[PDB]
Design a protein around this ligand. Structure first.
Ligand SMILES: C[C@H]1CCC[C@H](O)CCC/C=C/c2cc(O)cc(O)c2C(=O)O1
Ligand SMILES: C[C@H]1CCC[C@H](O)CCC/C=C/c2cc(O)cc(O)c2C(=O)O1
Lengths: 263, 264
């Protein structure tokens, strides 16, 4: 059944994490906002399909806020990957199918490139390679303004505003405090560190996705890179948060995709 | 410097309405499915000012080119349109050109690239239809008024700039009003499946493929994958389905720069 709790890793991070199911491991790395409650619904669906699912709030975000300052500053896919590996080590997860969007996606690719032995298959979604216009000066305004703007930006890219809104007051309160922290340590360093070089994409199977309703330009390069490297590339319903907008379709994708690499 | 406007009847019986501007290497602007060439007015001057003779026209059966046999606007495919264009190009004495086209215009560009490579200096396809959206699944079965109502809103939504779209004028929109039904009856059902996107259709001449920057990814997702896998230059243009209307300056710059690439 679903377990919820905390675990303090040797890097000082007091992780808030959840787990459900039995069977092969599936890890759901949240996006830049680091809020794992977004995976609640799909998590049950995936878990009921013969997989042990693990999710967690990201370092310094939401319930994983009790972490060293260093763990949420100058963030890169590889930096996050290191933290993830330490967490996986402590939870005794030897190998897993890994899902990730935005910064989570960058982490997935970092895992595939630097820790291929821990990845069964990677499922990156909308890897940031160039920050959009709206995030250029996000850190230059008051924290309250950052939360206001990012709350609007996120809701707009939710893929389903009713579902987004339906995440609940608790989640949205947590997100409120996350916005400024995310702005200060993610957007400027995440994109340039994207592990999308040829050397990063062939160690383990990868199934790449982008939002079906996401404006083409946003993650256009993701599609071209995948196609050029001969990596499976397709779309998922919604935009940036397919696990919130279309939990059923998201769960199905994670299950089928992961299931095909099992042996 | 001055816009040339006229009519010409080709051997196939089509009374074409066309426009031309500038002198030098030829640039042809094939309209989209709506076949309304007034959408290229602004960029037409911009491009022509850079040393190109630009030519555009209302598509057969559409707008001012409405006096055409019914077969020229029924069961339309990229190849059918290409045949007509070639005849027109012959009539206007255009030997080779840099050709632009969106939607059905894009299918036409690819057809030209595949079947009449000798007439194309470089192809610039934009949003080639390969898989119709659900909004068009049953558009050919409803009455003209409903088609016009729906397509007018549909088109405006895909304009990429509602203000510039609206600013096309009452004349244009009145012409568009009548084109909608005709388009629906002869394009959406047959254009997509006829898309000249086979491997052997894309490598006889240089091609520079584009998709709207604001267009929902899924709409022309296949265009991007095909291009990338086939090693064809692929990118985006600001706007959606009508970059020539929404962003005339950027559109003009793209056409000029890409065409320049293939000139000696
Ligand atoms: C915060 C989250 C979604 C915000 C909505 C935004 O509207 C999403 C726009 C796409 C980019 C998101 C992004 C860029 C970046 O450089 C680093 C990141 O961690 C993200 C990211 O995780 O996006
Ligand atoms: C009519 C024009 C744009 C209409 C707005 C619509 O919102 C455009 C939707 C995307 C595809 C348009 C299209 C599909 C097709 O199978 C054949 C076509 O000739 C077109 C086309 O030319 O699109």
């Amino acid at each position: 059944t679903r377990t919820r709790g905390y675990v303090t890793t040797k890097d000082g991070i007091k992780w808030y994490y959840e787990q459900e199911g039995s069977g092969p491991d599936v890890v759901l790395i949240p996006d830049g906002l680091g809020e794992c409650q977004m995976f609640d619904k799909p998590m049950s669906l995936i878990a009921s399909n013969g997989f042990r699912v693990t999710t967690f709030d990201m370092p310094g975000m939401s319930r994983s806020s009790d972490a060293p300052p260093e763990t949420y500053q100058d963030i890169t896919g590889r930096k996050l990957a290191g933290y993830i590996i330490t967490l996986l080590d402590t939870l005794d997860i030897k190998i897993a199918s890994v899902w990730g969007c935005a910064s989570g996606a960058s982490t997935v690719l970092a895992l595939c490139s630097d820790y291929p032995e821990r990845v069964r298959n990677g499922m990156p979604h909308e890897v940031p390679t160039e920050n959009p216009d709206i995030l250029l000066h996000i850190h230059e305004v008051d924290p309250a303004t950052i939360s206001q703007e990012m709350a609007a930006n996120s809701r707009a890219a939710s893929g389903n505003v009713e579902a987004w809104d339906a995440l609940g007051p608790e989640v949205h309160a947590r997100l409120h405090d996350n916005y400024p922290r995310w702005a200060y340590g993610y957007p400027r360093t995440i994109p340039p560190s994207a592990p999308v070089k040829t050397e990063d994409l062939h160690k383990v199977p990868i199934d790449w996705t982008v939002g079906a309703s996401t404006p083409t330009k946003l993650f256009f390069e993701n599609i071209v890179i995948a196609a050029r490297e001969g990596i499976n590339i397709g779309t998922l319903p919604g935009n940036h948060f397919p696990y919130v907008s279309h939990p059923e379709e998201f769960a199905k994708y994670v299950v089928e995709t992961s299931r095909k690499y099992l042996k």
